[PDB]
Copies of this chain bind each other. A is one copy, B any other.
Amino acid sequence: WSSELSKLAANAFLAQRISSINSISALCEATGADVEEVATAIGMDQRIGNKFLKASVGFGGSCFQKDVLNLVYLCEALNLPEVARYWQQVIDMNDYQRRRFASRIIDSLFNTVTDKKIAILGFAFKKDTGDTRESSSIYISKYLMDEGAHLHIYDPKVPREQIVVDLSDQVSRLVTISKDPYEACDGAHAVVICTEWDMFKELDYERIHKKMLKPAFIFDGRRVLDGLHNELQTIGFQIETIGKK
């Protein structure tokens, strides 16, 4: 039991680190601070550590949410409701972060995305995997699909059939799986980066902007385009990223 509880707790502590910094990212957006700068100051405390302080659209994977959900469930079964609602906030914050990002996209596109093309760059739950389990891209995609958006989804490693399954009628009408990222962005109103694949930092954003509809939005849900902000603004993109506004 101590072995299992230790695993259950360690995963939940990690997921907390993400929800805590994601919560600060929302406060940063609301007050003119930059979550990456705040995270750096936080992480230099050796008692906190500097890992797992990368604000994001939200953590995914088959571990963290499942782990916290089971921790909450175990506590509820043990009549520890105070403990249950403590850890539940880790999930609620992750869900809020995804929802907040999705509605920021919708808000920027004039409160309406029906029949608008939107490129989704990144579908795996993190870079360097084909795993999509609990990927934030699924939730962001579903929020945009529920708003009538036509998604063009590119991921360098997730298989096409997996993406259709993850997003499943409505998938047939609204979801396209692209072979390359330039095809996903061709004629798009907005590009939403959901997974921090290194190849996204190196895309030809000059070429992408030319063939996008204007105003051309990039929604960087992973902070992967930091330092390109100047170059991207000069190209003419309106860049919105988590934890900065």
Q: Which positions 52-71 of chain A face chain B at CB distance < 8 Å?
A: 52, 71
In the complex formed, the residue of B with least CB distance to A45 is: B10
Copies of this chain, tallied across the complex: 4
Q: Which positions 158-215 of chain A face chain B at CB distance < 8 Å?
A: none
Contact B5 A38 (CB under 8 A): yes
Across the interface, A27 reaches (CB within 8 A) one of B33, B34, B75, B92, namely B75
Q: Does A138 contact B (CB under 8 A)?
A: no
Contact B89 A48 (CB under 8 A): no
State whether A33 and B2 are in contact (beta carbons under 8 Å apart), knowing that A19-B86, A23-B86, A93-B86 are contacts in the complex. Answer: yes
CB<8 Å pairs between A and B, sample of 25: A1-B31, A2-B37, A2-B38, A2-B41, A5-B27, A5-B33, A5-B38, A6-B41, A9-B38, A10-B41, A13-B17, A13-B45, A13-B48, A14-B45, A23-B82, A26-B80, A26-B82, A27-B75, A30-B78, A30-B79, A46-B49, A46-B51, A47-B49, A48-B49, A82-B92
Interface size class of A (residues with CB under 8 A): 35 or more
Q: Which positions 1-32 of chain A face chain B at CB distance < 8 Å?
A: 1-3, 5-6, 9-10, 12-14, 16-17, 19-20, 23-24, 26-28, 30-32
CA distance A46 to B10 in the complex (A): 11
Closest Cβ of chain B: how far from A110's Cβ, in Å?
13
Q: Does A157 contact B (CB under 8 A)?
A: no
Q: Does A96 contact B (CB under 8 A)?
A: yes
Q: Does A85 contact B (CB under 8 A)?
A: yes
Q: Which residues of B contact A10 (CB under 8 A)?
A: 41-42, 45, 48
